[PDB]
């Protein structure tokens, strides 16, 4: 009976002084905004219904109109920043935070979902949700001995809504709010459900994308081992965020990078660097480039896990983006490595696939590959084997490539002839 109503009819019912008539129009509004295609969000906003829906959130004696109003307002906030702003401008945020204490779980869950859409718009509405005090009652819903006693969808919505209060930068989430949520976010990272685990890895990915002090807050909570275990999940939905967070922790200090290597992450990279998903390969090759930029003992740990042959293979065959992250991992390694390590890279077969990428267009990769050729030729000078390296490059067809490196970029043809003249 509340199916395919007109907006004028929903307006006539909500404009009535009958809460039961207002409930049937608020349910007809939810049904139109829950339709699979072209939800009429703008027509409902132009009708002036958000204010009446926000007052219906306060109707404790009509739990049905509160649920229907929360669903309708959740779907308007699901749309454009403009549509989410019309919900926040109706006074919705305080009203959704009261509904978090609803004895009805279906109404409390819709208030969680709504808040998630408001905070997901951006940092300003994320920070206004946090200012209106949403965190304490969100975290109170998860204050249970066993998260397994809560409904799957309820925990999945609460975990996605907490993820959105940990998301967006400029500004980044408030440090006090991040330290109030992390303890509960860690409990959800140890949960059995895969959607809760995926949205909990994304939240740690958002909190790790930032200055080293933000990375430290998370690494002090002891999550790196659980993130390294979720990096080995068979579910790409959990591996994609677990890798981003491990990758964002190796942007920090060599001591933070050393917690990842200590948790055993280098043992999963053989499969992440051979991953059928191009994003996982590229993201994992980028994580390897920030590990090769660290200490010589950390570069030796990469060598011990057998990852150099795997980086020679991403350089041999992979999406050019992954191959550019591999050139960067080889130049960082050849920059901070010992000579014993640089000669191991040439023994693993780095010369041919590195040189074959000098026939590419990007000047950035050409400047990176020629910066690694010099570092290797400098290690060869310290061993008196530059001639052998020159002959090896000549046979792979590299001197020919560097000879052609007649280029627009100066540093390119400058370094090219700095190497052609000095070693060839």
């Amino acid at each position: 009976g509340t199916v395919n109503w007109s907006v004028e009819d929903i307006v006539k019912g909500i404009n009535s002084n009958n809460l039961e008539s207002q409930l049937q129009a608020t349910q007809a509004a939810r049904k139109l905004l829950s339709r699979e295609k072209q939800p009429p969000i703008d027509n409902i906003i132009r009708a002036g219904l958000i204010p009446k829906f926000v007052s219906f959130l306060g109707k404790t004696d009509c739990s049905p109109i509160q649920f229907e109003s929360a669903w309708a307002l959740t779907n308007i906030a699901s749309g454009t920043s403009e549509q989410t702003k019309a919900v926040v401008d109706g006074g919705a945020i305080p009203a959704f935070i009261s509904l978090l204490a609803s004895p009805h779980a279906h109404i409390s869950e819709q208030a969680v979902w709504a808040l998630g859409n408001i905070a997901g718009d951006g940092s300003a509405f994320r920070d206004l949700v946090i200012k209106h005090g949403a965190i304490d009652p969100l975290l109170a819903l998860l204050a249970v001995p066993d998260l397994s006693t809560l409904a799957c969808g309820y925990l999945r919505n609460l975990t996605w809504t907490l993820s959105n209060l940990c998301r967006n930068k400029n500004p980044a989430p408030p440090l006090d709010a991040v330290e109030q949520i992390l303890p509960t976010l860690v409990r959800l990272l140890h949960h059995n459900d895969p959607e809760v685990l995926a949205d909990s890895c994304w939240a740690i990915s958002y909190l790790t994308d930032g200055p080293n002090e933000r990375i430290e807050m998370v690494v002090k909570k002891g999550v790196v081992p659980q993130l390294v275990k979720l990096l080995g999940a068979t579910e790409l939905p959990i591996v994609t965020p677990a890798l981003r967070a491990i990758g964002n922790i190796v942007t920090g200090t060599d001591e933070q990078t050393q917690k990842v290597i200590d948790a055993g992450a280098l043992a999963v990279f053989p499969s992440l660097l051979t991953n059928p998903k191009t994003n996982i390969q590229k993201e994992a090759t980028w994580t390897m480039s920030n590990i090769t930029a660290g200490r010589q003992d950390q570069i030796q740990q990469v060598v011990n896990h057998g990852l150099v042959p795997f980086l020679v293979g991403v350089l041999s065959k992979a999406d050019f983006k992954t191959q550019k992250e591999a050139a960067w991992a080889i130049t960082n390694y050849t920059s901070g490595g010992t000579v014993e390590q640089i000669v191991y890279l040439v023994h693993c077969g780095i010369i041919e696939p590195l040189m074959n990428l000098l026939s590419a267009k990007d000047t950035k990769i050409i400047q990176v590959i020629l910066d690694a050729i010099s570092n290797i030729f400098q290690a060869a000078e310290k061993l008196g084997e530059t001639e052998k390296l020159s002959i090896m490059i000549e046979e792979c067809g590299g001197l020919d490539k560097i000879e052609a490196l007649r280029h627009e970029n100066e540093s390119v043809y400058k370094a090219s002839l700095n190497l052609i003249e000095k070693y060839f």
Partner: peptide, 7 residues
């Protein structure tokens, strides 16, 4: 990310 509740 935002999520519309459908059906």
């Amino acid at each position: 990310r935002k999520r519309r509740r459908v059906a």
